[PDB]
Amino acid sequence: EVKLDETGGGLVQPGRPMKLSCVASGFTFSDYWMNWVRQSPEKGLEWVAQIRNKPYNYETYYSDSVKGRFTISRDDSKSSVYLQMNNLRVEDMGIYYCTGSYYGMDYWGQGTSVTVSSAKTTAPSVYPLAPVCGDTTGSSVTLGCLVKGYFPEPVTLTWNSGSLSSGVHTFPAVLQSDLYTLSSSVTVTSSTWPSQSITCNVAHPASSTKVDKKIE
């Protein structure tokens, strides 16, 4: 029975901010050793900040990576520790995890996500990628749907038409310069399904809107 909770992250523009709030309910916050560790997406776990407790004077060390820029601090009870990234330099961008320690063990957060860009809530242009100078085509036809230059992060692809069991493989979106680019495909049948149909169905809650692109 133990909880670490990373309370509040998000968007922030190359530059000068975000104070992060972790909360650990189910141990003597008091007597522990608390810290913040990260692993941007296309990043591995790296270790960021640590502070201790009474017996240790609440020592605090902070890694080079963000030493003198970042800061870790703590308040007992429904004890909330806090990192303070007033100074975000985008490579600082991943999930930031909160963690307890004690004798030898420790538990981790669910983590709070941090994305940082100068970009602006944009919308994706969506294109329909038709089996065009290819062979699988004829036997087995794959069609992709490209959805680009949207922002931020949460767009939804979805398929349609033709009519059966087909092989959709839609890849993790990636961050292009300052906006995301995504794609999807279906290996669907020859002409049977070709001749019937297939519609690419895309949407961004994230604001703007949901568009449809249709193969052919």
Add this chain to the structure above:
Amino acid sequence: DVVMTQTPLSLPVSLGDQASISCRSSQSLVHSQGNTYLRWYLQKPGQSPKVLIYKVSNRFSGVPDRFSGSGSGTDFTLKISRVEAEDLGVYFCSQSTHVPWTFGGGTKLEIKRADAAPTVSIFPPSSEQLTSGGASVVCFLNNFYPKDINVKWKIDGSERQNGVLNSWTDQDSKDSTYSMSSTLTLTKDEYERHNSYTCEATHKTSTSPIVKSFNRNEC
């Protein structure tokens, strides 16, 4: 920082098999008191990285029995003595003896199959794209194994462009295959400037390069 590394970086095994994932270090994580500070993390998808083992030998509550921690000083090993799929994930070895505290690259547990060579598939710019002044041709290597491929793009027989958005997806459902989409983005200007577009990729199963091609003029 202590160089805390892992061997291998990936691990293809099968549900019944067993693994030794290797972590070794900069110096012996043997602290004074409490002593050896080195932990073992399992991380499953979109998930927090739980730990299975602490201070080498200590297995942590719930951590299933099939799990063990060997080691001494600068050398460590964790062992699945039989991989249920639940065990599927990245395994990291961290050290809490020597500030700054460290995670190794992780070591990815994988179903070990046969199954495949990529079905490359190519796709020329869309009319609307073009009439967007934008032009990106696309390549998909679908359903391959083992993971390692390499994609390349060739304009007019001898290109290299910068404009590539490579995206990747591991499978953890049926066929145990991994797929890859790659994207060349250009101006409508460069697009109507070349004609011979090519997507050439080298793989395990390969021998010779796997290429797909199309021609502004014809394909």
